[PDB]
Design an enzyme around this catalytic site. Structure first.
Site, PDB file in Angstrom:
ATOM      1  N   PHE A 106      -1.480  -5.417  -2.342  1.00 32.79           N
ATOM      2  CA  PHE A 106      -2.085  -4.961  -1.141  1.00 32.79           C
ATOM      3  C   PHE A 106      -3.399  -3.789  -1.243  1.00 32.79           C
ATOM      4  O   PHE A 106      -3.718  -3.711  -2.447  1.00 32.79           O
ATOM      5  CB  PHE A 106      -2.001  -3.313  -1.146  1.00 32.79           C
ATOM      6  CG  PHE A 106      -1.635  -2.196   0.109  1.00 32.79           C
ATOM      7  CD1 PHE A 106      -1.342  -2.766   1.960  1.00 32.79           C
ATOM      8  CD2 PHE A 106      -2.053  -1.458   0.320  1.00 32.79           C
ATOM      9  CE1 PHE A 106      -1.907  -3.012   2.631  1.00 32.79           C
ATOM     10  CE2 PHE A 106      -2.769  -0.546   1.584  1.00 32.79           C
ATOM     11  CZ  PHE A 106      -2.631  -1.550   3.131  1.00 32.79           C
ATOM     12  N   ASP A 115      -9.259  -3.377  -8.066  1.00 34.08           N
ATOM     13  CA  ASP A 115      -8.821  -2.454  -6.744  1.00 34.08           C
ATOM     14  C   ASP A 115      -7.681  -1.400  -7.177  1.00 34.08           C
ATOM     15  O   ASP A 115      -6.703  -0.937  -8.022  1.00 34.08           O
ATOM     16  CB  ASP A 115      -8.335  -3.315  -5.378  1.00 34.08           C
ATOM     17  CG  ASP A 115      -8.166  -2.016  -4.262  1.00 34.08           C
ATOM     18  OD1 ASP A 115      -8.192  -1.057  -4.429  1.00 34.08           O
ATOM     19  OD2 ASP A 115      -7.186  -2.671  -3.552  1.00 34.08           O
ATOM     20  N   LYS A 139      -9.079   7.016  -1.555  1.00 37.36           N
ATOM     21  CA  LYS A 139      -8.118   8.086  -2.005  1.00 37.36           C
ATOM     22  C   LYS A 139      -7.972   9.645  -2.857  1.00 37.36           C
ATOM     23  O   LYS A 139      -8.320  10.278  -2.543  1.00 37.36           O
ATOM     24  CB  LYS A 139      -6.333   7.607  -2.503  1.00 37.36           C
ATOM     25  CG  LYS A 139      -5.758   6.848  -1.715  1.00 37.36           C
ATOM     26  CD  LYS A 139      -4.957   6.025  -1.813  1.00 37.36           C
ATOM     27  CE  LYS A 139      -3.954   4.862  -1.665  1.00 37.36           C
ATOM     28  NZ  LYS A 139      -3.449   5.527  -0.273  1.00 37.36           N
TER      29      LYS A 139
END
Ligand code: PLP
Lengths: 382, 378
Positions: free
Chosen positions: B118, B203, B232
């Site tokens: 993702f 990532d 985040k």
């Protein structure tokens, strides 16, 4: 090419439409961080909203809703054509969601082959691979490998060209009611109504990119209201959060069902709620038209003295001033001269000056800033 | 969810009815310092009364300071700030593509990615993501993306060539069932990127900024990427992201930092100052074992978990065959019992609490989770 600030121009403090740098130099802000700070810097109402929600709750994930997001979605739904809202962080993300939705709607409702997107030369929709490919500046979309396909570009305000490329395999027409980056060019009434009729005919969705021209910028809450042309999907950002990273995608229930509010950072939405409450008032919207003419009169007086503008255009407090052929490609030079004289302005391509000040910029700041700009012009033309 | 959170403080949350919850979800690993952390609130308030926004034409002091902090603490020499992890990943993938285009060949376009990856929900990032269900149905996808199994080094070797521009990988696939890269696999990725002159892209949107008990997961592995993305936890709740790389690679895009919202970077700066301390990083490992011991005790009682995995305070608990596909059932029961947890696919329970979650909150929340499991089993 690109406009970059030197080491001795670092803004540290903003109050209303005034900005100070590290050396304490004072600037009048007619740029608004590129039409973002629509209520100026550190507006007391927005600061209060930020601070109060900041003590309460900042972040919720997209599986949860939150009160600020619900309140904001309700306000957007009540005030616009929208029946459903989707919140994100930036204009680019809002446009991504809009383009994906138009694609997916066509896929599930009609055909997986109904994929053509019609966009326009000089269009700006963001800098992600998909949005920059929908954007109409090949130089910014070149050099990143295979672009997402089935995007067709034709000239802005050319209705016949749109008619010529559209068919049953077209899913969307994407357009900025006013192309902000593209020389501050407003759609003609015939062109924009023509887009609505063509989308109706071909069962394609009309997508309005109102990231720059939305949220009060034109003197209406959204530019589409001035035209009386209702899109299928609308995107909003910049002014929406008045400096806080927030965006929204607006559509109907029928279109949204292909995928009343989804997402929205609690802190972002509280701030955007406070901004909405101020911008969406008859008095502030009236003032935008009053303030525009105050700017325009100064620009006319500058042209009278210096003979530098061929056209003054745009809507509300999105102002474009096109330079005469003898000053073709000098927009960056006028911008830098302005900064020297203590006024922050914008470009809209190499030939166009752009102004996007706070929607509540004081008359005193308009006069002072424009006097500084007139000085800057005098330095350039001498 | 069926309830609406209105207030948070630390790792406890209240809904509209005043019901109190323990937060082991952290808005999907976002609130790394909990809700309304006094230091993050102070940073928000102080910068919020000074300056919120500058365009990318300008830098600003918060962005400069945060950039310097990230550069000093990591392999990075240059930092680009954005708003979301998707945007950071967009910038990273565009950069790897553009670097290959200008420094080697316009035909050097292949991106290697992994199944279950993702990387975001924009057309490009979702296409590099390894979940067809999420990338199907939006028209022609950005091409030249190849997917192979996560942790399969031989598959990567097989697909890579002189026409490959990047390998994109999550050091730990959080959404993909909390699966950690093996040392040989991650090291192999570095060797293959070196061989084919491709860029290794990490990532770390989910696994970065202290999540694993190191500032970034790559530090645990000792494998340095060419590009790294962070979001985040970076802003502890405030929408902010960063793309980190070298001067050599960043030069392909025509000081040491670019962009970054003044308000965002101030908050992120305060968050960085807390997370990047020996004490907080040590505590993440202490807290992990406190969680894991509860998970082991739950399995001892209810015979529910076949595997407990992840790193630091990214915790995955795979359900046994008897409870396969029912992670959502335990998530909802958890909420009913007053504890907020996550899934990582239909077979895995995921935990991503504040990195400074109090021991008392761990014990209380896990006891609530034990009761929730009990109500499901009964
Ligand atoms: C590993 C990873 N990459 C990218 C993203 C997308 O980031 P965001 O949701 O902030 O846009 C997420 C979520 C993530 O977990």
């Amino acid at each position: 090419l690109p406009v970059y600030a030197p080491a001795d121009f670092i803004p540290v403090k903003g109050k209303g439409s005034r900005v100070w740098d590290q050396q304490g130099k004072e600037y009048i802000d007619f740029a608004g961080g590129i039409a973002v700070t629509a209520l100026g810097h550190c507006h007391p109402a927005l600061v209060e909203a930020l601070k109060s929600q900041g003590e309460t709750l900042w972040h919720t994930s997209n599986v949860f809703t939150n009160e600020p997001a619900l309140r904001l979605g309700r306000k957007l739904i009540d005030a616009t054509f929208a029946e459903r809202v989707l919140f994100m962080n930036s204009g680019t993300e809002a446009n991504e969601t809009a383009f994906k939705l138009a694609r997916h709607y066509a896929c599930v409702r009609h055909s997986p082959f109904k994929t053509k997107i019609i966009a326009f030369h000089n269009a700006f929709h963001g800098r992600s691979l998909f949005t920059v490919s929908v954007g109409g500046q090949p130089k910014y979309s070149d050099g990143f490998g295979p672009k997402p396909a089935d995007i067709i570009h034709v000239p802005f305000n050319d209705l016949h060209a749109v008619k010529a490329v559209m068919d049953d395999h077209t899913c969307a027409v994407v357009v900025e009611p006013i192309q902000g980056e593209g020389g501050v060019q407003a759609a003609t009434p015939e062109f924009l109504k023509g887009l609505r009729d063509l989308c109706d005919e071909h069962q394609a969705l009309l997508v309005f990119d109102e990231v720059q021209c939305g949220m009060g910028r034109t003197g209406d809450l959204f530019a589409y209201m001035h035209y009386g042309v209702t899109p299928d999907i609308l995107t909003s950002a910049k002014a929406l959060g008045g400096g806080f990273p927030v965006s929204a995608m607006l559509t109907t229930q029928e279109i949204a069902s292909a995928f009343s509010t989804y997402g929205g950072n609690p802190l972002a939405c509280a701030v955007a709620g406070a901004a909405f409450d101020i911008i969406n008032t008859p008095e502030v919207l009236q003032g935008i038209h009053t303030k525009r003419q105050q700017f325009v009169q100064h620009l006319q007086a500058i042209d009278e003295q210096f003979d530098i503008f061929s056209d003054i255009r745009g809507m509300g407090l999105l102002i474009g001033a096109e330079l005469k052929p003898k000053y073709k490609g000098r927009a960056r030079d006028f911008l830098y001269a302005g900064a020297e004289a203590g006024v922050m302005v914008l470009n809209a391509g190499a030939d166009v000056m752009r102004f996007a000040p706070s929607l509540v910029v004081e008359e005193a700041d308009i006069h002072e800033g424009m006097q500084r700009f007139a000085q800057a012009v005098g330095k350039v033309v001498a």
